[PDB]
Each structure stands twice: as C-alpha cells, then as structure tokens.
Amino acid sequence: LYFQGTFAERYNIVCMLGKGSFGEVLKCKDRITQQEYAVKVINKASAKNKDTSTILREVELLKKLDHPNIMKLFEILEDSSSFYIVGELYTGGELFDEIIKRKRFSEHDAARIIKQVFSGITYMHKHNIVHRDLKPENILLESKEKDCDIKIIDFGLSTCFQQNTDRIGTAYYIAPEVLRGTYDEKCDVWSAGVILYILLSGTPPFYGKNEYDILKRVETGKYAFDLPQWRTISDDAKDLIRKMLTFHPSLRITATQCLEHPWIQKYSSETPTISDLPSLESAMTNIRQFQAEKKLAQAALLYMASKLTTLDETKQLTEIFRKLDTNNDGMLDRDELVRGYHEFMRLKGVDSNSGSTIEDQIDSLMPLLDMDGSGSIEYSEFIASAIDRTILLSRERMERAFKMFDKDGSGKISTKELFKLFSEQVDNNKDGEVDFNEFVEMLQNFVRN
Numbered sequence: 001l002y003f004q005g006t007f008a009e010r011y012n013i014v015c016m017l018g019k020g021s022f023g024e025v026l027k028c029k030d031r032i033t034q035q036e037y038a039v040k041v042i043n044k045a046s047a048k049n050k051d052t053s054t055i056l057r058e059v060e061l062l063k064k065l066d067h068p069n070i071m072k073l074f075e076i077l078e079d080s081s082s083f084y085i086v087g088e089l090y091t092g093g094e095l096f097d098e099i100i101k102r103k104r105f106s107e108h109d110a111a112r113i114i115k116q117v118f119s120g121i122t123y124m125h126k127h128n129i130v131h132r133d134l135k136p137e138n139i140l141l142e143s144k145e146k147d148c149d150i151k152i153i154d155f156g157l158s159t160c161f162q163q164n165t166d167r168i169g170t171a172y173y174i175a176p177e178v179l180r181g182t183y184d185e186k187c188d189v190w191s192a193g194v195i196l197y198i199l200l201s202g203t204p205p206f207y208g209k210n211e212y213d214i215l216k217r218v219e220t221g222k223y224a225f226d227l228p229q230w231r232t233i234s235d236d237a238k239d240l241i242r243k244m245l246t247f248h249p250s251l252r253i254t255a256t257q258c259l260e261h262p263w264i265q266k267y268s269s270e271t272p273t274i275s276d277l278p279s280l281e282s283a284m285t286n287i288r289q290f291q292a293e294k295k296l297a298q299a300a301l302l303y304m305a306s307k308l309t310t311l312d313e314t315k316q317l318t319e320i321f322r323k324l325d326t327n328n329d330g331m332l333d334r335d336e337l338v339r340g341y342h343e344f345m346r347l348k349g350v351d352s353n354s355g356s357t358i359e360d361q362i363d364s365l366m367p368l369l370d371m372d373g374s375g376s377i378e379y380s381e382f383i384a385s386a387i388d389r390t391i392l393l394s395r396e397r398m399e400r401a402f403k404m405f406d407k408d409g410s411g412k413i414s415t416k417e418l419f420k421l422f423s424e425q426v427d428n429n430k431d432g433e434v435d436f437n438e439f440v441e442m443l444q445n446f447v448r449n
C-alpha cells in the first residue's frame with residue numbers, strides 16, 4: 001500500500017475546468033470505470049480554516065444532499081497537499097450563458113427553470129445550508145439536451161476554507177441586508193428573485209453601469225416593473241417577484257412558499273402520459289424485484305446505484321421521477337407514489353379495483369425504499385429501485401465497488417471491511433474472505449436466486 005495515493009490511485013486528471021472562490025476545478029477520470037468527474041482541489045495549507053476532522057464531517061453532510069437540482073458530490077479524498085472533492089460532471093455550462101443566448105424567457109420557460117432553483121434551495125434550507133452567492137453563474141445545465149435539469153453549484157465550503165482572495169455583476173444579486181454583514185435563508189430568496197426578474201425581462205432589477213451605482217440601487221430596495229416588456233407579463237409572476245424582493249426579510253416569503261406559489265403550479269403540470277408507459281412499466285418491474293430481496297441486497301444496490309451510475313443511464317428514470325414529483329420538491333412522497341401508480345393503471349387501460357390494493361402495496365414498499373428513513377424517496381433511492389439491475393453489474397463497476405471496500409488492499413474483503421457497504425456470507429474456497437470473484441458472485445446472486 002505505501003506507493004498508492006487515495007486520489008491518484010483511483011483517478012487521473014484530464015484537464016482544468018475553471019477556478020472560482022474556493023480552490024480549483026478539474027476534470028478527472030476513474031482509472032477503472034473510465035467515467036469522468038469534476039474534482040475541486042483545495043490546498044490544505046493555504047486554505048484550511050478548520051481541523052481536518054471538522055472539514056470531513058461538514059463535507060460528509062454535503063455528500064448526503066440528494067436532490068436533482070443540487071450538485072452531486074461522490075467523495076472527499078486527500079493527500080499531503082490537498083483535499084479533492086469529487087462530483088458529477090455537468091457539461092451544459094452556466095445558466096448565465098443561456099440568458100445571454102436567449103435574452104428573455106417566456107413565462108412557461110422561466111417557470112420550469114426557476115422552479116428547479118426553488119426546489120434545490122428549499123431542500124438546502126431544510127438541511128440548514130444557505131447558498132450565500134446564488135446567481136446564474138453558479139447554476140449549471142446538466143447537459144446540452146433541451147430542458148435538462150439545472151444544478152446549483154458552489155456552496156457549503158465557506159466556514160471550512162478560506163477563499164482564493166474581481167467577479168463582474170455579482171452586485172446584481174445581493175440582498176440589502178448582505179450590505180449589513182447578514183447572510184441567511186432569506187438572502188437566497190432575494191437572489192432567486194433577482195434571477196427571476198432577469199429571466200422574464202432580460203434586465204437586472206437594480207441596474208447600473210458599474211458596481212457603485214448598482215449597490216446604491218440595491219440598498220434602497222427600490223425597483224419597478226416599468227420596462228416595456230413587463231406590460232405583457234402576468235400579474236401572478238409580478239406577485240411572486242414582489243414577495244421575493246420584499247425589503248424586510250422577515251416579511252419576505254420562504255423558499256417553500258416560492259416553490260408553492262400559484263404561478264409555478266400553473267407551469268409545472270407535467271404528468272405521466274401514454275408515451276411514458278414503457279418507462280413506467282420498466283420502473284415498476286424493477287421496483288417489485290427490489291422489494292423482494294434481502295435488506296442486504298437492497299442495501300448493496302443503493303450503494304452501487306448512488307456511486308457509480310451516470311447521467312445517460314438515468315435520464316429516462318429522471319424524467320419519470322420528475323413527472324411523479326407532483327409538488328416539485330425533488331422527492332417522492334407516499335401520496336405521490338399512490339397517485340402515480342393509479343395514473344399508470346389508468347393510462348394502461350387497467351382498472352385499479354382489480355388481493356392487495358395500490359395503497360397497501362405502496363405502504364409496505366415505503367420502508368424498504370426510504371432507506372435513510374427521511375419520509376421521502378429521494379432521487380438516488382428511486383434510481384436504485386427503478387433501474388435495470390443489469391446495468392450496475394458491469395465488470396468495471398464491480399471492480400470499483402470491490403476496491404472501495406477492500407480497505408487494506410489485501411485483495412480479499414474481510415467481514416469488518418465488508419460491513420462498510422451495507423452499513424451470513426458465502427465463501428466458496430472457505431478462507432473466510434471474499435476475493436473479487438466471490439464478491440462478483442455475491443453481487444450477481446443479489447439480482448438472481
């Protein structure tokens with residue numbers, strides 16, 4: 001083990017992606033799976049503001065954020081000079097560029113975008129994380145596909161790490177209380193309100209040639225819907241923006257109230273159709289298999305689906321997820337699954353009335369699906385249960401899972417090493433240990449008899 005690094009053994013750096021406030025962002029590649037990732041490299045000695053143990057606990061909470069509109073982080077690794085924070089790679093660029101290209105969005109297009117910002121921010125705030133610098137440059141498009149999900153990036157590190165030490169246009173998005181040294185949940189709502197005002201109008205609500213004049217406007221909180229293009233935008237969109245850019249933060253609406261505003265609901269009516277039946281049929285086949293398997297099987301599968309799947313693999317399940325997610329909060333609750341299953345039947349021409357109802361089924365399934373006990377089925381739990389087991393069983397994926405657990409790098413998993421993954425066994429050669437070939441059988445057996 002002496003000549004193996006944690007980061008360098010698993011990943012090869014491909015090139016630089018960019019550099020913002022904390023550390024620096026590169027593209028890296030898993031040396032076994034060949035899957036590509038975004039890694040933020042932070043220099044320990046320059047940048048650390050807390051002991052390592054503090055930092056690992058805070059970053060661990062960031063890895064646990066599982067929401068379709070929040071950047072996905074897979075791990076934090078270290079060497080003697082750096083922390084490496086490895087995340088999912090997004091290729092669609094900043095929402096900012098999409099503003100430049102489009103200039104302005106219709107009410108429908110703006111609602112579909114801002115609703116995801118609301119969703120992601122609601123979830124952050126429920127997990128007691130404030131963004132602090134929400135703006136279009138810190139939201140990425142998952143890909144170049146049309147209507148792909150947005151991803152909120154660049155948050156969560158400001159107490160663990162010191163900044164690098166001339167961002168242009170950042171003054172547009174600041175709430176007035178930020179000028180008084182305050183950052184809190186309500187500052188994110190204000191920033192989201194400035195984003196919306198720009199999506200609808202093409203123009204900042206507190207505007208000016210340079211940072212001085214802009215900051216002057218922000219500070220009074222004075223803005224208008226005076227630009228000609230506003231005459232044609234609905235009162236409902238204006239009502240929402242007014243609630244978000246309310247001067248006094250205690251009067252300003254919460255992110256959940258943003259998510260639930262009637263203007264959002266008016267443009268988020270996405271719902272399963274006939275064209276989704278193939279996706280829905282497949283998802284359901286696989287979810288029954290999952291319910292059937294040992295808690296141990298279910299456990300290993302969640303781990304593998306959440307660490308090793310890719311965007312391309314999950315995009316159709318992503319779409320089904322989104323259509324079942326009725327209230328747009330980025331997770332599936334019990335009623336949503338019951339309605340979803342009733343809607344699947346209706347679409348298929350099958351009468352729900354036909355030994356065990358839809359509601360009993362869902363009720364017995366929630367505890368198995370909701371593996372962290374959250375009260376909801378988050379993104380990754382749905383993917384684990386709804387994806388083709390097959391897909392996860394590629395040889396390279398098993399090898400990477402095997403290496404995640406072989407802590408000592410002996411070539412064989414011990415009992416203690418193995419619990420990690422799930423947190424009796426069958427050994428063919430009976431050394432009391434699992435070399436890879438047995439581990440493949442073990443995982444392959446989970447899907448099988």
Ligand SMILES: Nc1ncnc2c1ncn2[C@@H]1O[C@H](COP(=O)(O)O)[C@@H](O)[C@H]1O
Nearest residue numbers: 017018019020021025038088089090154
């Ligand atoms: N997950 C990601 N995928 C692609 N590019 C990223 C990712 N995270 C950050 N970047 C780029 O890296 C730069 C610095 O990111 P940050 O310091 O987090 O704002 C910006 O260009 C980002 O668009």
Ligand SMILES: [Ca+2]
Nearest residue numbers: 325329331332
């Ligand atoms: Ca929901």
Ligand SMILES: [Ca+2]
Nearest residue numbers: 370374376378
């Ligand atoms: Ca859950």
Ligand SMILES: [Ca+2]
Nearest residue numbers: 410412413414
């Ligand atoms: Ca071992």
Ligand SMILES: [Ca+2]
Nearest residue numbers: 427430431433
């Ligand atoms: Ca063995």
